[PDB]
């Protein structure tokens, strides 16, 4: 594993999580589109989400809480929006793992150029 | 083996002095049983006397209360070890917490008069 | 000891910082301090009940290990998940205490587990409620204990905890499965050991109904709280599958390891008084050493 | 808003009721374990109401009933913040104490001081 | 508690019931007024083993200072009766 | 099952 | 009074105490309380239980999962 | 009673329910039953109480205090002017403490009505609170237990000498 | 009681040592007092420092919580050595190997938590991305002042 | 063994203890003293309803008429709802 | 009440034995019902994305 | 408890005390009864060396070796009883244990609440006051004038009289009250 | 004020001119009416302090002390009744006369416009307390205890007279509000430092802290119950009213002369709480408990925070009612067993159910319960001393640890336990003693309910 490797292997080719992203985002990519937030600041502020929950995928969290409020007290029937919000949190986690593996391949590029 | 301690003592069944005993030690145990029998018969006679209406005046408990209360200063002798250890235990942490309190308050007064310490929301001091 | 020292009093130390969620978050040293100290509590009170002997003492170490695991998640900064562990933990832990008291009042205050047995053929209601309470303590799926403790183990695997805290909390929850196997093996299982006058009285509905109420709570409460409560933290479900079912893996592994350990005492062999069993049986020596060397120095300084 | 306040002080009043009975001379006349488990059962039945309306609408309340005493700038207003922690733990604690009073009415049958025992638990 | 109180004849039948289950006791020889040393001819271990039988039979602890002195079923019945404090 | 007398201090005072 | 059972119904055989007594007699001794402690292994109590029979208790009636919710 | 100039609460902006499920919500049914059982005799008891209060209705007045010359205008040695200025300063100190209580109540009510996202609409209340705590720490901080108009005047003269030295 | 049966002074002579032994109802040869260090003990007899847990439990006592007899000499540290307070009962395992075991467990666990603090055991994942210049409008700041622009891109 | 000097004392004392416990038995005349859920409905009237009347009178007319003491958290406003108080609609999500 | 037996089985009542049997039967019914309705305890999501087989062009190629 | 300890424990008393501590710390260790009976007859295969030892110095040496073996292989938590000291219910029922002098301080309303029992307690007190003046005279003539006095009290030598020192034994409260 | 002072002075012919059967009922009923007419001082509708005459003034800090004097008089005259059931009539009326005269001059000391009137009626307490202690004390050492009390307080109070006459001949009138308002700052001079020590040493002896704490346990184990309640519950804190009222002269010097008395206070309260863990005499244990609870307010008035003064005054009336209830319980146990050793009388809850409840409430107000005024005063003193220095809270934390340990040590020793059964003479609890501790505790419950009255001088 990565945790298995960075203890008692080389830490130059293996990233540390506190300096992520260490590289500027301009190298490797010609352009990057920003993650355009579907839920805006006014709808998020009026929906009153906690600052831990205000991620890049609160667009389905607001729909989850709206369907839970409009489907009270049939809380068993609000699992589809929980599945969609967990899929969007899985997409945020695959973007985080993608920037992790892009950081480790860019450090491999740094150690190949050096 | 089992090492002894002042706080975890040797039991008398594991004690080596219970296994090499002498007839003078056995006579001491017989006299200890005899004095416990005399004190138990006096206590049980005062327990089961129906003419008694008051409590049991315990002379050894009165002796222990008198020894812990009003015998210590009549049995004082001023020794240098008692004088030095009492002077340390009665003076030492006053100079120690004097140095702690004066160092912390000199630090606090210096930081207030220099402006580094800020009382942001400190209304009731 | 069932309402006080199992359910409501002991979780107040968690409840102070679950109330103090917005001050705990911006400080990072006290998160690691409470994480390490709750993890050390979880190891010590899961290794104390490995060979413990009084039944209320075993479930006391069970609630102390669960309290340390709530402090692990509180220092991991999911205090809503710590409170989910409180509100799911209280039902099965008070059920295990009430089942132990039902055995105590049916066997006339016999608290050592080495003179009680065969409870699944003597008292079937108390044994069925004991296996649903101990199984919700162990963490079989979709009980009241799974809907906290599985998400607890997912947060343990996914956040920036210590590696020794990872190893020590997974080892202590394997030991939680081992002490649950100790209660099941030495209370509900084996050929009996009670005193021969068998006076059995659980046919009172005053005894039958509240254990049914805590069993219906322990079968229907973790789902209803974890479904009715809105998403109040971030649950991440994308982990590797060797790290996703690892709570069930170490629970069945602790069950099989404690089965192969406890089945050796049925066999005719010699028992060894090793210092590991002295550490486990004699409560880790902390009351002996602290509760004699602190009052001796304190009262000796007080007198002299 | 109005029902959400008086349900939580009705929980506190119904918990204060077996202490209020036990001062008087009714304690030698009513079935106090059955009275206390009926009081904590009706307190849990009352306590399922803020559980259900917090599950519906998710409103966290700050209830300062008695302005106790004011010192300099500090006021010491007696207050009852009921939220995700307090509403859920009052419902779970009242359900488990309903279980404990119904268990203790059988388990403490040999002890003749069960009124003092249940007064201490209340 | 839910345990019934113990009669003298029930305590005598329980003590005789454990005492006839020992291997070196003839049950036709065994009466309630027979001495363990000189009337059934038992050894020093067997008296304290009868004491362990009463320990795991009646669920209470007999001290060894009484248990050395106890030597016959009639006063082991009377000692167990006077320790559990039964009126007959 | 005849009731035994419980011994108890004077609760009248 | 209480109707005590008779002592003749507690034999040694059919118990693990029989196995203990025959291994102990192969050593060359005898067990004096083997007829006394045979009530824990002889009678209704004879027959050890298994971990399906304590944890999977009621699984044959708990396998009533219904697909009829249409 | 309630006055919006000293206690400004924003009005409630609760949404319409609009339940999508066919199952009716028990909270609105139980609160209609709760209103029809409980709230109507309670408001009839309050209507009887307000009818009796309007029958035996009286008035009480807020006490007004005339301003005396303060301790900067009074003379040391003249004890009576010093006592009048000292009690004027003690009345102003009591009303300053309850003004700090008013801003503290405003801060608590704004934080509770803003909830977890409290910063964006509590910035103005926290600015008002940090202004009044800066004013109170300039006014009556470290005065001692025996706070006086003379000691507050000495603190104010110390700060104005510090500002005169800085300027 | 009188001044003779009340305690006083120190036994300097063996006849007053025997008189103090018959005062305290103890044996003459067992009468070992405290040493004359001027600490105010005096003629009080030094018993061995064993707590009341170590006495015989099954023997019926005159003072039942104290496990003492009437007229038996009460220890100077009896309030120290009462059954609520510190026991000097014999442990199953000795004190030095007990202290080595407990302090070895504490020091090994503190050093292992330092090892776990040195290697902080991270999942292969980046930081949690937060939008809108990393919530600087919602963290608490001036809205008239422009926030520092951080931009979280796609991959 | 048992000496007969202790055995005579223990026999007479055990006979006296049996006499004392049979004397501590109580006589049958000795202590002299001077529907389905109807009590549940009576408790639901006399200890649920009338303290709800008292505490509801407290909450509505001694508490909520004094300010900043029953402060609600703001209920959650979602894209698609219409607040009844000022009649405005929220714009929908993107 | 019970008539407590000596050295044998107590006469176990049908209320106690069907009460415990139906409680454990309802517990395994709840376990099998929820395990049939969602197997997310073992499943979770579809799979975790292992970073070893990520293609470099959708990862973003490092230059040269 | 009801008898008295001697001045010294004898060699047979210490050997049987080691047998009692061995056969309870076994079944503290060997939990199942098959292992308890096999290891208990192994303890009989260990007593058989101590049967005909004749020196008594070697018997006390074997006593020291077996006691050191017992303290080395003893259970850290031994088997305890509900009625034993250090146990689950050691003096648990002390709420009942209020002695018979406290019934003298009852009010006459509570004394008329129990008519026949207080008349029989008056009969027991009359038996006390008519037995004590011959009980205290019996101890001063059965007291030996020699320097050895035992702990065990003498019985009723005179016919028709009670044993000396009887009230504190006969009016203890019951150990299992309710 | 004179409607409280002068009918208390007219209680003397009520004692001396009535029948000896009826002295106790007339004096207790009319002294409860003295407390009812001494509730009239709570009419502060403004921060203007009540000055009824040029002789006497009412202060907001002095008014719970003045209701505690007028409330403590019938609580002493209840408790002296079975204490004096065997003494004759003229000694009984002399005891009632000395108690009433102590109440009169304590009312007159707490109502002081002028500090030399305060000194006259401050040293006028030293005669009747000595009359109570050294005549009606039940042990040998009451002569030594009276000499200790009298000479500790007089060797404190002589330089108080020196510094008061020096301050008066320096600046003019010793009236408290005159010398509050017209006064000036004191220069940092060594003669002013000796003036500080001279005017503070009387109150530094009267409130027991180390060096000079030792007269209190001798004059509490050799006192009767009325002398012990007065010396534990208001007459010890008469010097604390003086330590409050002196410091307004001389506030600039306290911020560097404060440190040895706070030091001696804090280490004295740790060591006296440590003393109470191993004590034989229960009255001595409550006496050294009063030494620790007085060392707290010695630190609290040696700092001049207003927060400290509120926590100080709350600790004054909480300590007075709690220590008076605890000493009354110790007198009840002394009345039952005719000794004061805690070890010899255990298990008393088995024969006294409601006296166990009053023991529980007194020692569980000594251990500072949170809605009670004990933790209210100690928490405000903790706030003020943490404002003074951030490293001081471990010392008072160690003190609160050992005060919990000695309070529940006294509960577990003398209330719970095996019930020592060698006492026939444990007669059941009197209606006098039960209503005496009820009239102790129910003012503490109502003072918990309304703490606006107890806020002291400074808010
Ligand atoms: C797994 C756990 C490991 C750790 C487990 C515990 C380890 C330690 C176990 C220790 C067990 C103990 O040694 C058992 C033994 O040997 S018992 C021998 C008793 N046998 C006799 O005494 C002989 C018969 N007696 C007489 O013939 C008369 O009494 C006599 C004439 C001698 C009286 O003479 P005198 O005295 O009057």
């Amino acid at each position: 594993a990565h945790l298995t490797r960075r203890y008692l292997w080389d830490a130059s080719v293996e990233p540390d999580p506190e300096k992520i992203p260490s590289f500027p985002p301009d190298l490797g990519f010609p352009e990057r589109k920003e993650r355009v937030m579907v839920a805006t600041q006014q709808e998020m502020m009026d929906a009153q989400l906690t600052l831990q929950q205000r991620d890049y995928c609160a667009h389905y969290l607001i729909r989850l809480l709206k369907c839970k409020r409009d489907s009270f007290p049939n809380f068993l029937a609000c699992k589809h929006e929980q599945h969609d919000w967990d899929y969007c949190e899985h997409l945020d986690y695959v973007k985080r793992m993608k920037e992790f593996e892009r950081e480790r391949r860019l450090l491999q590029r740094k150690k190949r150029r050096a | 083996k089992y090492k002894p301690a002042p706080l975890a003592t040797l039991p008398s069944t594991l004690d080596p002095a219970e296994y090499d005993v002498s007839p003078e030690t056995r006579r001491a145990q017989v006299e200890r049983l005899s004095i416990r029998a005399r004190l138990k018969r006096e206590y049980l006679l005062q327990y089961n006397d129906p003419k008694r209406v008051s409590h049991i005046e315990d002379p050894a408990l009165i002796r222990w209360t008198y020894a812990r209360s009003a015998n210590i200063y009549p049995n004082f002798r001023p020794t240098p070890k008692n004088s030095l250890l009492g002077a340390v235990a009665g003076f030492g942490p006053l100079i120690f917490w004097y140095y702690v309190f004066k160092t912390d308050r000199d630090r606090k007064e210096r930081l207030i008069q220099e402006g580094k310490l800020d009382r942001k929301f400190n209304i009731s001091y | 000891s069932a309402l006080l020292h199992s359910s409501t009093m002991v979780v107040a130390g968690i409840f102070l910082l679950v109330r103090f969620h917005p001050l705990t978050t911006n400080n990072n040293f006290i998160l690691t301090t409470m994480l390490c100290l709750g993890a050390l509590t979880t190891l010590f009170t899961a290794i104390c009940a490995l060979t413990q002997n009084d039944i209320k003492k075993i479930i006391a170490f069970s609630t102390s290990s669960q309290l340390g695991l709530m402090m692990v998640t509180l220092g991991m900064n999911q205090p809503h998940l710590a409170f989910l562990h409180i509100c799911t933990h209280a039902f099965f832990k008070a059920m295990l205490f009430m089942c132990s008291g039902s055995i105590i009042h049916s066997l006339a205050d016999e608290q050592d587990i080495r003179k009680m047995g065969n409870i699944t053929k003597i008292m079937p209601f108390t044994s069925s409620c004991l296996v649903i309470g101990s199984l919700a303590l162990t963490g079989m799926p979709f009980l009241t204990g799974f809907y906290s403790k599985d998400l607890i183990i997912e947060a343990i695997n996914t956040c920036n905890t210590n590696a020794w805290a990872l190893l020590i909390t997974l080892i202590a929850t394997s030991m939680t499965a081992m002490y649950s196997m100790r209660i099941i093996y030495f209370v509900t299982m084996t050929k009996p050991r009670f005193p021969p006058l068998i006076s059995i009285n659980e046919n009172d509905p005053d005894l039958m109904n509240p254990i049914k109420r805590l069993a219906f709570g322990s079968i229907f409460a973790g789902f209803v709280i974890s479904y009715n409560i809105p998403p109040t933290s971030i649950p991440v479900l994308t982990m590797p599958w060797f790290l996703k079912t690892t709570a069930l893996i170490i629970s069945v592994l602790g069950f099989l390891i404690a089965l192969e350990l406890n089945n050796l005492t049925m066999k005719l062999s010699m028992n060894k008084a090793n210092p590991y069993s002295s550490f486990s049986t004699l409560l880790g020596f902390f009351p002996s050493i602290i509760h004699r060397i602190t009052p001796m120095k304190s009262l000796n300084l007080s007198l002299k | 808003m109005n029902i959400f306040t008086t349900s939580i002080l009705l929980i506190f009043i119904l918990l204060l009721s077996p202490i209020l009975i036990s001062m008087s001379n009714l304690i030698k006349h009513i079935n106090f374990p059955l009275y206390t488990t009926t009081s904590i059962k009706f307190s849990f039945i009352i306590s399922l109401l803020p559980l259900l309306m917090f599950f519906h609408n998710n409103m966290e309340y700050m209830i300062t009933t008695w302005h106790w005493v004011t010192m300099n700038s500090m006021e010491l207003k007696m207050s009852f913040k009921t939220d995700f922690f307090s509403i859920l733990f009052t419902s779970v604690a009242l359900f488990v104490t309903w279980s404990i009073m119904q268990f203790s009415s059988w388990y403490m049958h040999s002890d003749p001081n069960i009124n003092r025992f249940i007064k201490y638990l209340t | 508690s839910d345990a019934p109180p113990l009669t003298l004849d029930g305590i005598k039948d329980r003590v005789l019931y454990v005492l006839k289950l020992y291997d070196k006791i003839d049950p036709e020889k065994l009466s309630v007024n027979s001495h363990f040393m000189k009337d059934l001819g038992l050894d020093s271990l067997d008296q304290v083993e009868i004491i362990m039988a009463m320990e795991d039979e009646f669920g209470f602890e007999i001290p060894d200072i009484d248990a050395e002195k106890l030597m016959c079923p009639q006063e082991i019945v009377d000692y167990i009766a006077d320790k559990k404090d039964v009126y007959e | 099952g005849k009731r035994l007398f419980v011994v108890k201090p004077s609760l009248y005072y | 009074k209480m109707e005590l059972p008779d002592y003749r119904q507690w034999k040694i055989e059919g118990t693990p105490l029989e196995t203990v007594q025959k291994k102990l007699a192969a050593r060359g001794l005898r067990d004096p309380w083997a007829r006394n402690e045979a009530w824990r292994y002889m009678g209704g109590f004879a027959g050890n239980i298994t971990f399906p029979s304590v944890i999977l208790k009621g699984f044959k009636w708990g396998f009533a999962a219904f697909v009829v919710a249409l | 009673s309630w006055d919006k100039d000293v206690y400004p609460e924003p009005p409630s902006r609760t949404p319409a329910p609009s339940p999508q499920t066919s199952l009716p919500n028990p909270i609105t049914y139980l609160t209609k039953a709760y209103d029809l059982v409980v709230d109507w005799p309670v408001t009839l008891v309050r209507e009887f109480i307000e009818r009796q209060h309007a029958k035996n209705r009286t008035y009480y007045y807020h006490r007004q205090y005339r301003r005396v010359p303060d301790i900067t205008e009074c003379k040391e040695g003249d004890v009576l002017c010093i006592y009048e200025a000292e009690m004027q300063w003690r009345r102003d100190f009591k009303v300053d403490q309850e003004i700090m209580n008013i801003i503290q109540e405003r801060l608590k009510a704004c934080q509770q009505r803003e909830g977890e996202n409290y910063q964006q609409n509590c910035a103005k209340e926290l600015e008002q609170f940090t202004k009044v705590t800066k004013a109170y720490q300039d006014r009556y901080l470290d005065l001692g237990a025996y706070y006086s108009a003379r000691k507050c005047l000495a603190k104010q003269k110390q700060r104005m000498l510090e500002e005169r030295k800085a300027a | 009681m009188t001044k003779d049966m009340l305690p006083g002074s120190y036994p300097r002579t063996p006849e007053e040592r025997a008189a103090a032994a018959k005062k305290y109802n103890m044996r003459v040869e067992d009468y070992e007092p405290y040493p004359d260090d001027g600490m105010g003990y005096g003629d009080y007899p030094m018993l061995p420092n064993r707590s009341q847990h170590e006495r015989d439990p099954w023997y019926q006592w005159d003072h039942s919580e104290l496990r003492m007899n009437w007229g038996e000499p009460i220890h100077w540290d009896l309030d120290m050595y009462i059954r609520n307070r510190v026991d000097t009962s014999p442990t199953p395992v000795s004190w030095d190997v007990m202290c080595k075991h407990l302090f070895g467990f504490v020091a090994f666990m503190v050093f292992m938590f330092w090892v776990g603090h040195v290697f902080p055991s991270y999942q292969p994942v980046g930081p949690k991305q937060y939008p809108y210049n990393n919530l600087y409008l919602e963290r608490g700041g001036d809205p008239t002042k422009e926030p520092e622009p951080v931009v979280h891109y796609d991959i | 063994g048992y000496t007969p000097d202790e055995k005579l004392r223990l026999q007479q004392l055990r006979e006296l203890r049996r006499r004392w416990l049979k004397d501590q038995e109580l006589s049958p005349r000795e202590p002299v003293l001077p529907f389905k859920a109807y009590r549940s409905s009576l408790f639901a009237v006399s200890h649920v309803l009338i303290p709800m009347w008292f505490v509801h009178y407290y909450v509505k007319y001694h508490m909520a008429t004094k300010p900043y003491t029953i402060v609600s958290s703001k209920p959650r406003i979602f894209p698609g709802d219409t607040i009844l108080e000022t009649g405005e609609v929220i714009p929908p999500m993107r | 009440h019970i008539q407590p037996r000596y050295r044998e089985f107590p006469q176990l009542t049908r209320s106690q034995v069907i009460q415990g049997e139906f409680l454990s039967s309802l517990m395994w019914f709840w376990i099998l019902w929820r395990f049939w309705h969602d197997s997310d305890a073992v499943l979770g999501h579809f799979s975790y994305p292992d970073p070893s087989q990520w293609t470099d062009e959708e990862l973003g190629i490092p230059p040269d | 408890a009801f008898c008295a300890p001697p001045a010294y424990l004898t060699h047979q008393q210490k050997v049987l005390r080691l047998y009692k501590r061995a056969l309870r710390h076994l079944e503290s260790w060997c939990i199942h009864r098959d292992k308890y009976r096999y290891f208990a007859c192994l303890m009989r295969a260990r007593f058989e060396e101590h049967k005909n030892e004749k020196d008594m110095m070697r018997a006390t040496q074997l006593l020291r070796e077996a006691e050191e073996e017992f303290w080395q292989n003893q259970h850290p938590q031994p088997y305890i009883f509900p009625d034993s000291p250090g146990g689950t219910s050691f003096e648990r029922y002390e709420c009942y244990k209020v002695p018979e002098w406290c019934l003298d301080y009852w009010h006459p309303s509570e004394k008329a609440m129990y008519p026949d029992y207080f008349s029989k307690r008056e009969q027991w007190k009359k038996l006390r006051m008519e037995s004590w003046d011959r009980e205290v005279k019996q101890l001063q003539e059965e007291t030996s004038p020699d320097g050895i006095m035992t702990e065990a009290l003498p019985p009723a030598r005179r016919e028709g009289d009670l044993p000396p020192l009887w009230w504190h034994i006969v009016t203890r409260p019951r150990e299992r009250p309710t | 004020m004179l409607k409280i002072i002068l009918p208390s002075l007219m209680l003397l012919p009520l004692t001396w001119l009535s029948s000896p059967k009826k002295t106790w009922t007339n004096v207790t009923s009319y002294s409860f009416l003295i407390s009812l007419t001494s509730l009239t001082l709570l009419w502060q509708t403004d921060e203007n302090y009540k000055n009824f005459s040029n002789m006497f003034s009412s202060d907001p800090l002095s008014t719970p002390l003045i209701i505690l004097t007028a409330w403590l008089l019938p609580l002493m005259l209840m408790a002296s009744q079975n204490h004096l059931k065997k003494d004759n009539n003229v000694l009984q009326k002399l005891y009632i006369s000395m108690l009433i005269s102590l109440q009169i001059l304590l009312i007159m000391t707490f109502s002081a416009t002028e500090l030399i009137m305060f000194y006259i009626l401050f040293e006028a307490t030293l005669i009747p307390t000595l009359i109570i202690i050294t005549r009606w004390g039940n042990q040998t050492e009451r002569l030594n205890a009276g000499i200790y009390f009298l000479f500790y307080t007089l060797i404190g109070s002589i330089p108080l007279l020196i510094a008061l006459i020096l301050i008066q001949n320096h600046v003019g009138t010793l009236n408290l509000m005159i010398l509050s308002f017209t006064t000036h700052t004191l220069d940092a001079s060594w003669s002013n430092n000796l003036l500080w020590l001279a005017c503070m040493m009387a109150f530094l002896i009267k409130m027991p802290l180390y060096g000079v704490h030792l007269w209190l346990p001798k004059a509490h184990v050799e006192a009767p119950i009325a002398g012990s309640m007065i010396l534990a519950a208001i007459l010890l804190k008469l010097g604390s009213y003086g330590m409050i009222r002196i410091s307004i002269i001389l506030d600039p010097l306290t911020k560097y002369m404060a440190y040895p008395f706070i030091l001696l206070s804090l280490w004295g309260m740790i060591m006296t709480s440590s003393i109470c863990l191993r004590q034989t005499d229960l009255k001595s244990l409550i006496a050294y408990s009063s030494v620790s609870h007085m060392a707290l307010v010695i630190a609290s008035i040696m700092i001049q925070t207003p927060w400290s003064f509120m926590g100080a005054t709350m600790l004054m009336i909480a300590h007075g009612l709690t220590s008076s209830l605890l000493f009354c319980l110790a007198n009840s146990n002394y009345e039952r067993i005719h000794s004061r050793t805690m070890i010899m009388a255990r298990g008393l809850q088995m024969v006294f159910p409601l006296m166990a409840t009053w023991w529980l409430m007194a020692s569980l107000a000594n251990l500072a319960l949170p809605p009670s005024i004990n933790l209210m005063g100690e928490l405000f003193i903790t706030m003020s001393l943490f404002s003074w220095s951030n490293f001081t809270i471990i010392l008072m934390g160690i003190n609160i640890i050992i005060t919990g340990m000695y309070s529940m040590y006294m509960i577990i020793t003398t209330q719970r336990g095996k019930l020592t059964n060698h006492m026939i003479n444990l007669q059941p609890s009197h209606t006098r003693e039960l209503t005496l501790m009820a009239l102790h505790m129910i003012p503490l419950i109502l003072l918990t309910t309304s703490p606006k009255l107890i806020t002291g001088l400074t808010m």
Side-chain angles (χ1 to χ4, degrees), chain B residues 2-113:
Chain B
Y2 164 77
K3 219 180 86 63
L7 254 178
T9 86
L10 253 179
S12 83
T13 76
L14 207 64
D15 205 293
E18 209 74 272
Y19 287 165
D20 62 334
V21 309
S22 57
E24 44 265 67
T25 320
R26 280 274 187 275
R27 209 154 321 122
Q29 290 160 278
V30 167
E31 288 336 280
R32 275 181 216 101
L33 190 70
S34 161
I35 202 65
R36 195 196 278 111
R38 281 150 164 83
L39 290 177
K40 191 95 157 193
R41 280 262 212 84
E42 286 295 324
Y43 178 62
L44 275 184
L45 229 52
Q46 296 183 32
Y47 205 107
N48 288 32
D49 172 48
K51 292 321 201 285
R52 209 213 54 214
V53 62
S54 45
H55 66 287
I56 294 296
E57 201 92 352
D58 201 344
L61 262 178
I62 286 324
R63 261 172 242 136
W64 174 68
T65 300
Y66 193 56
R68 291 275 298 278
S69 282
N71 213 26
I72 310 188
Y73 198 50
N75 291 47
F76 184 34
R77 298 166 334 123
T79 82
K81 297 304 135 176
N82 273 33
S83 164
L84 194 125
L85 194 141
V88 160
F91 267 131
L94 311 173
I95 313 119
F96 164 70
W97 289 114
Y98 181 71
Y99 287 160
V100 168
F101 283 166
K102 197 78 203 201
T103 299
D104 183 64
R105 280 195 48 85
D106 163 70
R107 165 203 318 190
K108 202 160 60 72
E109 174 106 3
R110 166 197 323 273
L111 286 207
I112 283 304
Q113 287 180 337

Side-chain angles (χ1 to χ4, degrees), chain A residues 6-33:
Chain A
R6 211 176 54 88
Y7 221 68
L8 296 199
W9 280 93
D10 36 4
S12 99
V13 312
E14 207 99 358
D16 210 68
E18 74 209 349
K19 35 173 184 139
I20 295 201
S22 81
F23 274 80
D26 215 293
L27 313 91
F29 266 140
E31 77 269 52
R32 288 135 72 81
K33 324 166 272 192

Side-chain angles (χ1 to χ4, degrees), chain C residues 271, chain E residues 43-45, chain L residues 12 15-16 18-19 22 26 29-30 39 43 46-47 50-51 56 66-67 69-70 73:
Chain C
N271 42 287
Chain E
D43 222 306
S44 322
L45 316 178
Chain L
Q12 275 299 295
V15 153
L16 279 196
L18 247 197
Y19 206 39
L26 202 86
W29 276 113
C30 309
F39 264 56
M43 188 92 59
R46 230 208 67 83
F47 93 110
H50 291 180
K51 171 73 119 215
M56 304 265 169
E67 171 90 8
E69 218 177 295
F70 158 72
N73 314 331

